[PDB]
């Protein structure tokens, strides 16, 4: 079997990346909530 998660960081940053978020309006709402909730790990990064 193949458990549903075989990673590839390029596709990870293309879908959940900072710029992948900031480029759209809906993404801008998310970080607004993330900063308000005070979560340190806003997105996926290094």
Q: In the complex, which residues of this chain contact RNA (CB under 7 A)? A: 1-12, 14-15, 23, 25
The minimum distance between CB 22 and RNA, in angstroms, equals 12
d(CA 11, CA 1): 22
Residue among 2 and 41 whose Cβ is closer to RNA:
2
| Dihedral sign (CA 10, 14, 17, 18) | positive
Residue among 6 and 38 whose Cβ is closer to RNA:
6
The minimum distance between CB 45 and RNA, in angstroms, equals 11
Q: Tell me the H-state helices in the chain.
A: 9-15, 18-22, 25-36
């Amino acid at each position: 079997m193949k458990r549903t998660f075989q990673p590839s960081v390029l596709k990870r940053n293309r879908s959940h990346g900072f710029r992948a978020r900031m480029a759209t309006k809906n993404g801008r709402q998310v970080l607004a909530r993330r900063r308000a909730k005070g979560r340190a790990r806003l997105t996926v990064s290094k």
